[PDB]
Amino acid sequence: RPLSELVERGWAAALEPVADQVAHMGQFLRAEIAAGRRYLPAGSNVLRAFTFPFDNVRVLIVGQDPYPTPGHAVGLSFSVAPDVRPWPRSLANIFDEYTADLGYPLPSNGDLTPWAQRGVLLLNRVLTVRPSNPASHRGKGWEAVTECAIRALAARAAPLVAILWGRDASTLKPMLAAGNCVAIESPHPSPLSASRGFFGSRPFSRANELLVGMGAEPIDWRLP
Ligand SMILES: O=C1CC(=O)NC(=O)N1
C-alpha cells in the first residue's frame, strides 16, 4: 500500500526517504494485533496529521505519544472526538492556557480539526501506543519517521514555528535551526509537568507574533 494511498501527496514525497520504515511499522502493528495487543489510535488515523497538506503547515506542534486510554487518540496530537467528555487532562490544561493567552471562551469540545485545517501540524514524536500503557511504543522506529517529517518541514523554504511540548525539546531544536524556522519549548501540558512552566507560556500568541514577524499570516486559533 504505497504512502500516496495513506497520506497527502506532498507528505508522501516528503516521506519517500522513510517509506520502508513506514511499511515496517505496519508489520509491527499487524504483529501487535496478532499477539492480542491492540494499539491506538485506529490504523486509519495513525498517519492522519500527514493527511493535511505538507505545503500548508505554518505551525508544527510536537508532543510525545498518543493518549493511552481507548476512545481518546485520533491521530492528531492532543485532539479527541467531538462528543468526548471528560477531556483528557493534557487537553483541559491546553484549553485553560488557551483562554489565559487568547481570552476566547472555553472550547465546546476537544476536536482540534480546525487547527489542522489552518496549517497547524499536530505531531507526536511516536504515533502509536499500547492501550493503558503510556509511551509503550517508544524506540519501535517511529522516531526516524517523525524526524524525517520534521527535517522535511524545516527545509521547505516557507515560514515555520515549532512548539516543542515536553522531553523531546532538546532533541528536536537542532533539526529546526534554519533562518525560516523558530522553535519555542515549554514543559509538557500533562498534569505533572504543566505547573512547572506550561501554564503562563502563552505559546499561541507567541507563535502568531513570530509568524507576523516572518511576513506570514497569523493562525486563527478560535475553536467553537
Ligand atoms: O496525552 C498526550 C496525547 C498526545 O497526543 N500527545 C502527547 O504527547 N500527550
Side-chain angles (χ1 to χ4, degrees):
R1 195 158 191 204
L3 279 178
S4 297
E5 304 183 334
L6 312 163
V7 308
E8 176 266 355
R9 278 159 184 204
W11 272 116
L15 302 174
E16 183 61 357
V18 297
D20 283 342
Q21 288 97 303
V22 172
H24 285 91
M25 294 311 304
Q27 258 124 38
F28 172 80
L29 292 173
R30 186 199 179 146
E32 283 292 299
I33 301 177
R37 287 196 308 284
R38 263 273 15 157
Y39 67 85
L40 301 158
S44 72
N45 294 324
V46 163
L47 295 180
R48 195 185 164 183
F50 310 133
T51 65
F52 299 85
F54 174 77
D55 293 319
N56 291 338
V57 166
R58 244 191 257 147
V59 178
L60 159 69
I61 304 189
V62 194
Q64 301 175 184
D65 304 75
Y67 285 125
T69 305
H72 276 185
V74 300
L76 294 174
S77 63
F78 299 99
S79 187
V80 296
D83 37 71
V84 172
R85 287 184 84 71
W87 304 332
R89 294 286 205 249
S90 279
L91 191 56
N93 291 354
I94 283 164
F95 276 173
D96 268 309
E97 188 48 34
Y98 166 93
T99 70
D101 188 354
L102 301 163
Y104 299 160
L106 219 249
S108 303
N109 58 47
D111 184 14
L112 306 181
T113 293
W115 292 357
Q117 295 166 345
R118 297 168 187 172
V120 186
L121 181 74
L122 291 160
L123 190 59
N124 278 309
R125 188 83 176 106
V126 176
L127 290 184
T128 55
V129 69
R130 313 194 319 84
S132 302
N133 182 178
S136 34
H137 282 163
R138 279 280 171 165
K140 289 306 212 294
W142 273 133
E143 286 78 352
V145 183
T146 60
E147 153 172 10
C148 167
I150 296 168
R151 266 185 209 286
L153 278 165
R156 258 193 325 167
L160 181 74
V161 175
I163 303 153
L164 313 172
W165 288 339
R167 59 168 157 182
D168 305 294
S170 51
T171 299
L172 289 184
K173 276 215 165 173
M175 312 172 177
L176 281 166
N180 61 311
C181 310
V182 174
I184 67 181
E185 70 181 83
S186 76
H188 197 277
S190 155
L192 280 200
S193 38
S195 39
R196 49 248 246 173
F198 179 71
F199 284 113
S201 72
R202 299 285 182 281
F204 307 108
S205 61
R206 272 189 83 200
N208 274 352
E209 273 150 16
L210 296 179
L211 280 176
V212 168
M214 279 176 259
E217 268 286 289
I219 303 297
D220 183 11
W221 291 107
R222 186 73 135 295
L223 291 168

